[PDB]
Ligand binder design. Structure first.
Ligand SMILES: O=P(O)(O)O[C@H]1O[C@H](CO)[C@@H](O)[C@H](O)[C@H]1O
Ligand SMILES: [Mg+2]
Length: 449
C-alpha cells in the first residue's frame, strides 16, 4: 500500500492497530500542530473502547509540539465542533469510529471556527507529514486542561425552542448504546417531554449492535418502541450522534429528504428570508418548501465540507442533506443531531399536527426512490449506458455533483461517492409513484448491465 489507507476524503478512518494506532495518533497530533493557526486544540472522543487511548496519544503529540489541549472528554462529534468555535480554539479533533466495525476507529479534524480539514484542505498534508515522520517523540511542552462543562452547549441547544410553547409529548429516544443518551438526560430536566429510553446506556461493546438506524433490524427497534408505547414520535442516532433519524407515531421511518424541507421551514419561522443550502440528490420538495416559507434555496454539491463553505459564503441560516446531516449557522455552521429533534418537537407542539401529517402530503407530492447504491465493474461505462439510453428524451442536465437529469415530471441524480468506491442513485417524480418505480428499475438495469 503506497499511502496510509486510513486517510480518507473527509476524515481518518481505519482498522486498529494496522491502519490506526497510538503511534500514528501521536504523529497526527504533531502534524496537526503544524497545520493550524495560533491557539489550543479541543479533543473529544466517543464510546469506543480504544478511543480514550487514541485521544491521549493525540494529546501527547500536540503538547510535545507546544499546543495546549482542552479535553472535553466523552462527547458527541458536534460538541467538538461547538467547543472549538465557542472557546475560539485553533482547532479540534473528535476521536470516533461512527458506524464502522468493532476493530475500527478514526478521527474528524477541524481548524478555527470548526472549519473542516479535508483531504484537499490539510488532511493529506497531515498524512504526508505523518508518512515521512521518523523523529523520536519529544516530551510535552504544553499543558492539558479538563473541561467537561456542557452548560454553554446545552444552553445553545435549548435556545432553538420556546420552552413555554412545548407540550408534554411522549418521545422514544434510541441512542443505540452510543453517546446520545447523556445529552438527552441533561436536556430532560428543562423539557416537558416524556422520554421512552431505548438502548440508552453508553456501551462500547455494543450489545445491541453498532449504532446505525438505517439498518432495518436497528430501525425496527425504534419503530416497535414507538408503536408499543403510543409515542408521538421516535428519534434514533448514530454513535457520535451527529446524525438523527425520525419515526412518526405509526412507527414509520421518515426518509431524510423530507426533513430538509421541514427543518428549513422551522428555521425560517425564526429567521425570515434566510438562505437555505441543500444538496443536488433530491431537490424539488426542498426548493418548494423553502420558497413557500419565504426562504431562498441554494444548490450545493453534497458533502459536509462543501455544504459548510457554501453556507458561510451565503450567510445561510440552515443547510440540510438527505443523508441525515443538518447544519445550523449559529452552531458554528456545523451539524447537530440534537437541534433537529428539538425543532421538530416544537413544530409538533405548536401546530397540533403529528409528525406524520407534517410530511405526509410532501411525500405524496414528491416521492423518491431512496438512495440506491451500486458496486459495478466499470462505473464510468455504467453511467455512460444510462445517459446514452435517455439521450433522445433530451433531459436538462446539471453537473454540480455527478449528473443530474431533469425530464420534467421526473429527475435523477447519479453520483460517485467520495467516501466509498460506489455509485449512488436518487430518483424523484412529481406525484407519480408508478413513474418513480419504472424509471428507478430502468436505471438500475442499465447500471447493472
Ligand atoms: O459518500 P458520499 O455520498 O460522497 O458522502 C456521504 O458522506 C458525507 C459525510 O458523511 C456526507 O456529507 C454526504 O452527504 C454523504 O452522501
Ligand atoms: Mg456520525
Amino acid at each position: 500500500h503506497m499511502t496510509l489507507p486510513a486517510f480518507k476524503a473527509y476524515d481518518i478512518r481505519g482498522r486498529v492497530p494496522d491502519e490506526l494506532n497510538e503511534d500514528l495518533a501521536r504523529r497526527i497530533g504533531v502534524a496537526l500542530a503544524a497545520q493550524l493557526d495560533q491557539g489550543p486544540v479541543v479533543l473529544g472522543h466517543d464510546v469506543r473502547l480504544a478511543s480514550p487511548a487514541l485521544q491521549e496519544a493525540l494529546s501527547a503529540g500536540l503538547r510535545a509540539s507546544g499546543r495546549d489541549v482542552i479535553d472535553i472528554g466523552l462527547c458527541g462529534t458536534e460538541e467538538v465542533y461547538f467547543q472549538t468555535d465557542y472557546l475560539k480554539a485553533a482547532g479540534g479533533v473528535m476521536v470516533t469510529a461512527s458506524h464502522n466495525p468493532m476493530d475500527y476507529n478514526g478521527m474528524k479534524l477541524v481548524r478555527e471556527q470548526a472549519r473542516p480539514i479535508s483531504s484537499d484542505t490539510g488532511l493529506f498534508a497531515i498524512r504526508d507529514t505523518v508518512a515521512a515522520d521518523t523523529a523520536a517523540p519529544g516530551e510535552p511542552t504544553a499543558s492539558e486542561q479538563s473541561r467537561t462543562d456542557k452548560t454553554a452547549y446545552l444552553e445553545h441547544l435549548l435556545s432553538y425552542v420556546d420552552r413555554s410553547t412545548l407540550k408534554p409529548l411522549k418521545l422514544v429516544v434510541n441512542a443505540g448504546n452510543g453517546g446520545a443518551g447523556l445529552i438527552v438526560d441533561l436536556l430532560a430536566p428543562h423539557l416537558p417531554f416524556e422520554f421512552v429510553r431505548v438502548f440508552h446506556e453508553p456501551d462500547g461493546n455494543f450489545p445491541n449492535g453498532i449504532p446505525n438506524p438505517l439498518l432495518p433490524e436497528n430501525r425496527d427497534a425504534t419503530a416497535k418502541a414507538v408503536k408499543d408505547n403510543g409515542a408521538d414520535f421516535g428519534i434514533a442516532w448514530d454513535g457520535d450522534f451527529d446524525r438523527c433519524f425520525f419515526f412518526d407515531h405509526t412507527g414509520r421511518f421518515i426518509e431524510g429528504y423530507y426533513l430538509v424541507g421541514l427543518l428549513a421551514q422551522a428555521i425560517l419561522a425564526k429567521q425570515p428570508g434566510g438562505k437555505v443550502v441543500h444538496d443536488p440528490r433530491l431537490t424539488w420538495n426542498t426548493v418548494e418548501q423553502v420558497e413557500e416559507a419565504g426562504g431562498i434555496p441554494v444548490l450545493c454539491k453534497s458533502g459536509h465540507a462543501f455544504i459548510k463553505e457554501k453556507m458561510r459564503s451565503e450567510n445561510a441560516v440552515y443547510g440540510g442533506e438527505m443523508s441525515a446531516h443538518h447544519y445550523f449557522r449559529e452552531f458554528a455552521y456545523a451539524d447537530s443531531g440534537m437541534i433537529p429533534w428539538l425543532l421538530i418537537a416544537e413544530l409538533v407542539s405548536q401546530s397540533g399536527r403529528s409528525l406524520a401529517d407534517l410530511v405526509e402530503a410532501r411525500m405524496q407530492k414528491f416521492p423518491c426512490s431512496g438512495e440506491i447504491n451500486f458496486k459495478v465493474a466499470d462505473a464510468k461505462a455504467s453511467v455512460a449506458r444510462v445517459m446514452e439510453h435517455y439521450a433522445s428524451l433530451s433531459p436538462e442536465l446539471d453537473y454540480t455533483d455527478g449528473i443530474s437529469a431533469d425530464f420534467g415530471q421526473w429527475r435523477f441524480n447519479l453520483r460517485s461517492s467520495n467516501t466509498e468506491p460506489l455509485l449512488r442513485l436518487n430518483v424523484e417524480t412529481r406525484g407519480d409513484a408508478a413513474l418513480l418505480e419504472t424509471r428507478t428499475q430502468e436505471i438500475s438495469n442499465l447500471l447493472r448491465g
